[PDB]
């Protein structure tokens, strides 16, 4: 019963914010790490954020550092991502991904969303 769906999105003016979500069901959510991967409409993939299981250690690329905000709550069994002061080159597709091996960060990614 492993499933990953999403919410949020739409149209944001340059100078606004957007706060997404990710619904996770089926596995045990408190024993994996979770990460957002983006897909440009020009057929190219790019990485956004990741976060370990306990929620204390985050990692960020340098190209978007200090601007995005990622968090976890264990009991709610869902994932967040908070944006602020967007730009124009963010017109793309987003996804929500679980890592492969348990307790890990940064290996592969086996089950995405849609």
């Amino acid at each position: 019963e492993v499933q990953l769906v999403e919410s949020g999105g739409g149209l944001v003016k340059p100078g606004g914010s957007l706060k997404l979500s990710c619904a996770a069901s089926g596995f045990t959510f408190s024993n994996y790490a979770m990460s957002w991967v983006r897909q440009t409409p020009e057929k190219r993939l790019e990485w956004v954020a990741t976060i370990s299981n306990g929620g204390r250690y985050t990692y960020y690329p340098d190209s978007v550092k200090g601007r995005f905000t990622i968090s976890r709550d264990n009991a709610k069994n869902s994932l967040y991502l908070q944006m602020s002061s967007l730009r124009s080159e963010d017109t793309a597709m987003y996804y929500c991904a679980r890592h492969l091996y348990r307790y890990d960060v940064g290996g592969a990614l086996d089950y995405w969303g849609q």
Partner: protein, 48 residues
């Protein structure tokens, strides 16, 4: 409490071994697995 001053040497030696194996472990297993062995002030806890 009257026994521990004739026993303090072994305690100092075991603390030294914790310091050595902690500084080995926190840079071997530190890229991946960040919550257990990431810093040093939690690698002491995982080795304990």
């Amino acid at each position: 409490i009257s026994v521990i001053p004739g026993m303090l040497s072994v305690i100092a030696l075991m603390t030294l071994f914790f310091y050595i194996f902690a500084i080995m472990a926190t840079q071997l297993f530190g890229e991946r697995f960040p919550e257990w062995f990431g810093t040093l002030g939690e690698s002491f806890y995982t080795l304990f």
